[PDB]
């Protein structure tokens, strides 16, 4: 029901991240959130690979994935 949104943002990432490394770092970040289940670790690493206007779209992009609860805590941790 909301799979297109993932591939849509993910697709945007590839467009804004031609390199493979940036993608490698992002992969580790996503795997961390799934394993650790902590949005605090995601915010930190996220900025590292999303500290640029061009990379910013990833911060807001991945968010939608995060559950409502983690969304509130995630949004709080983020500059907004």
């Amino acid at each position: 029901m909301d799979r297109k949104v993932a591939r849509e943002f993910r697709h945007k990432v590839d467009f804004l991240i031609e390199n493979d490394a940036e993608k490698d770092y992002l992969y580790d970040v996503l795997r961390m959130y799934h394993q650790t289940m902590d949005v605090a670790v995601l915010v930190g690493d996220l900025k590292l690979v999303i500290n640029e206007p061009s990379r910013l779209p990833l911060f807001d992009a991945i968010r939608p994935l995060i559950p409502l609860k983690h969304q509130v805590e995630y949004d709080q941790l983020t500059p907004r």
Partner: peptide
């Protein structure tokens, strides 16, 4: 439905 997991699988598949 685990959206995060969906994106991870999407990438792994987009790799090949």
């Amino acid at each position: 439905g685990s959206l995060l997991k969906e994106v991870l699988e999407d990438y792994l598949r987009l790799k090949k």
